Design an enzyme around this catalytic site. Structure first.
Site, mmCIF file in Angstrom:
data_model
loop_
_atom_site.group_PDB
_atom_site.id
_atom_site.type_symbol
_atom_site.label_atom_id
_atom_site.label_comp_id
_atom_site.label_asym_id
_atom_site.label_seq_id
_atom_site.Cartn_x
_atom_site.Cartn_y
_atom_site.Cartn_z
ATOM 1 N N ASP A 1 97.235 5.121 94.103
ATOM 2 C CA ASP A 1 96.667 5.275 92.769
ATOM 3 C C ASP A 1 95.207 5.671 92.864
ATOM 4 O OD1 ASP A 1 95.933 5.169 90.116
ATOM 5 O OD2 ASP A 1 96.088 2.990 89.920
ATOM 6 N N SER B 1 87.134 20.394 84.355
ATOM 7 C CA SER B 1 87.921 21.614 84.339
ATOM 8 C C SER B 1 87.204 22.678 83.513
ATOM 9 C CB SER B 1 89.321 21.333 83.759
ATOM 10 O OG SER B 1 90.055 22.527 83.603
#
Length: 330
Positions: free
Chosen positions: A35, A199
């Site tokens: 994770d 992004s």
């Protein structure tokens, strides 16, 4: 040193991925959820409330000659999806894919929430976010990666998740046969303890690319792709019959649909998520309404590049003094 371990979807939908981990002496092998959105290594154990264990493999520290109680240490964690666990702490030898850490904090569950009990395939989590998020008190503990870092050939690990198929986690090296083209690296903020990056934008299907900054985290422990409501609305508008359902808890779509791809930007580069990756199947057995793999982050408080996004790429978690993230197509 290096390590290399195969990671395997827990079910037909890629709801999560499990990776075998050796704990203790002699080894006890547990299948953990790697994770990159959390920083605790915790396991089902011989200490876990018996009614809360349903099929998982447990760590029994009393059977490990290298286990030592970390006196006074406790832990407690709550995840984004509302699940939780807590307990006490041992140090023990932990190996992943041939890579060995001695004295790793192994957090032994005394309590787990229902969602963990109900998932017989996940024996615990292995956190790979930054150690600043680790919940052990009163002495915070280091992640497996943090502990291994100095010994690795290169201070990196990589996630290569499969679509409906096994993939690979590598530690200490970049497998240049595992991706196509070049790796594009992008800056990371560690200020929230996550692999947080920005992004450069997105496209829907064959649509034109929209340049826009989207701050979010690279999180292998989250199944879906969670993005701003504007972006998610633009995607599902291209799917006839798609709608956001309050009762189901997200966007659903007719299972008879053909989903368009979704592209996200990494600097000047582009990662394409095929449409099929965004299908998470009937909302309930036999339903013709299907759950979408792209969902709104509104009310989460952060955008999450979860498995739906990450499995479309070869992803480098660069733990150099200034961390960065790399993405390549594959």
């Amino acid at each position: 040193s290096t390590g290399s371990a195969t990671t395997t979807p827990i079910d037909s939908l890629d709801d999560a991925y499990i990776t075998p981990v050796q704990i203790g002496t002699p080894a006890q092998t547990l299948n953990l959820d790697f994770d990159t959105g959390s920083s605790d290594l915790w396991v089902f154990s011989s200490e876990t409330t018996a009614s809360e264990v349903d099929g998982q493999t447990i760590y029994t520290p009393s059977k490990s000659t290298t286990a030592k109680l970390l006196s006074g240490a406790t832990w407690s964690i709550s995840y984004g999806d509302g699940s939780s666990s807590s307990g006490d702490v041992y140090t023990d030898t932990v190996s992943v894919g041939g890579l060995t850490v001695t004295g790793q904090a192994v957090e032994s569950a005394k309590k787990v929430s229902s969602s963990f009990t109900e998932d017989s395939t996940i024996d615990g989590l292995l956190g790979l976010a930054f150690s600043t998020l680790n919940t052990v008190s009163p002495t915070q503990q280091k992640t497996f990666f943090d502990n291994a870092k100095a010994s690795l050939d290169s201070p990196v690990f990589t996630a290569d998740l499969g679509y409906h198929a096994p993939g690979t986690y590598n530690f200490g090296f970049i497998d240049t046969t595992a991706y196509t083209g070049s790796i594009t690296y992008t800056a990371v903020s560690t200020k929230q303890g996550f692999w947080e990056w920005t992004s450069t934008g997105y496209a829907v299907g064959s649509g034109t690319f929209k340049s826009t900054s989207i701050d979010g985290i690279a999180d292998t422990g989250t199944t879906l792709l969670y993005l701003p409501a504007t972006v998610v609305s633009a995607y599902w508008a291209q799917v006839s019959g798609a709608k956001s359902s309050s009762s189901v808890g997200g966007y659903v779509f007719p299972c008879s649909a053909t989903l368009p791809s979704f592209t996200f930007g990494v600097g000047s580069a582009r990662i394409v998520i095929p449409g099929d990756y965004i299908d998470f199947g009937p909302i309930s057995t036999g339903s013709s309404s299907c759950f979408g793999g792209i969902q709104s982050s509104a009310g989460i408080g952060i955008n999450i590049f979860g498995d739906v996004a990450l499995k479309a790429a070869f992803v480098v978690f660069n733990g150099a003094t200034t961390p960065t993230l790399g993405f390549a197509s594959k």
